[PDB]
Amino acid sequence: GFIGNSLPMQAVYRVIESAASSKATVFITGESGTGKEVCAEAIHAASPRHDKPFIALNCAAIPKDLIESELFGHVKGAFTGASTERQGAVEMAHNGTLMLDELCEMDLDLQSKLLRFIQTGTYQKVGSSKMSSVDVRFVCATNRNPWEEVQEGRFREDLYYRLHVIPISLPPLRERGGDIIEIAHALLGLMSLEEGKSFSRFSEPVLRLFESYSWPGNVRELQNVIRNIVVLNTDDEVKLEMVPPPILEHHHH
Numbered sequence: 001g002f003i004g005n006s007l008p009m010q011a012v013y014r015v016i017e018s019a020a021s022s023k024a025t026v027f028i029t030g031e032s033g034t035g036k037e038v039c040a041e042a043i044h045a046a047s048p049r050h051d052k053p054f055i056a057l058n059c060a061a062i063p064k065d066l067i068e069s070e071l072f073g074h075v076k077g078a079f080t081g082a083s084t085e086r087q088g089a090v091e092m093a094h095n096g097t098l099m100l101d102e103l104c105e106m107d108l109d110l111q112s113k114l115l116r117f118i119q120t121g122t123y124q125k126v127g128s129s130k131m132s133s134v135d136v137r138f139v140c141a142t143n144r145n146p147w148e149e150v151q152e153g154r155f156r157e158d159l160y161y162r163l164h165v166i167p168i169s170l171p172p173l174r175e176r177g178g179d180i181i182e183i184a185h186a187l188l189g190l191m192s193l194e195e196g197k198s199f200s201r202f203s204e205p206v207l208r209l210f211e212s213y214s215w216p217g218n219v220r221e222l223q224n225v226i227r228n229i230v231v232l233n234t235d236d237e238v239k240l241e242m243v244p245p246p247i248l249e250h251h252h253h
């Protein structure tokens with residue numbers, strides 16, 4: 001799902017092409033909305049395990065105290081809400097690729113257990129002493145500055161240096177050249193399908209604005225802007241009056 005031929009993204013693609021056949025852990029950083037899960041899936045797709053599962057553990061979408069349960073599973077009655085026995089994400093990912101997305105959300109106690117798991121594939125369901133293991137290739141991602149998280153004592157140093165093997169620093173959208181308008185056009189077609197519309201072009205002022213705007217929310221912000229336009233309007237072309245706040249006003253400062 002990567003779109004873009006820009007110089008810094010072609011450097012990302014070279015990393016992916018050369019590292020994907022390895023089982024080496026890839027560690028992805030970049031600003032919010034830069035495509036870290038798309039990048040992770042592209043590593044999976046380029047790897048020999050492309051036809052096996054690609055599982056993303058989205059830590060910022062799981063209640064913090066339940067990430068362990070979601071990752072490792074749990075036996076019935078392990079804790080107050082453990083109504084059923086649960087299969088962990090690690091079992092879903094066996095023989096495939098496991099993305100630990102936004103893993104700096106994990107609390108220090110979970111990080112201590114993760115340290116075992118990433119070395120051997122060994123884990124226990126919450127509530128149980130029984131050990132199992134799985135075969136997974138890791139990809140990690142965070143929006144945080146990992147070295148700052150380690151310095152402030154929020155992320156384990158031993159864990160970081162065993163995960164941080166092949167780094168990818170995704171470029172922010174504002175540094176991606178022709179990619180902004182390439183992604184915008186692809187989103188215009190996708191959102192047109194989603195809304196039952198037919199947008200395909202941008203006027204010249206919109207092209208200029210989108211190319212120069214700093215996109216502090218990166219590709220998610222661009223997705224939200226295109227969705228806003230296609231939901232609210234019906235045209236073949238995006239016009240400057242359609243661009244939502246605060247794009248124009250922030251660019252003016």
Ligand SMILES: Nc1ncnc2c1ncn2[C@@H]1O[C@H](COP(=O)(O)OP(=O)(O)OP(=O)(O)O)[C@@H](O)[C@H]1O
Nearest residue numbers: 001002003004032033034035036037038183219220
């Ligand atoms: N290069 C790209 N080309 C096309 N679509 C992209 C690209 N990068 C990201 N996207 C789209 O943007 C959305 C966000 O991607 P992803 O979830 O990979 O981002 P993230 O960096 O993990 O950030 P967020 O934390 O905002 O979710 C997805 O719908 C994805 O398809």
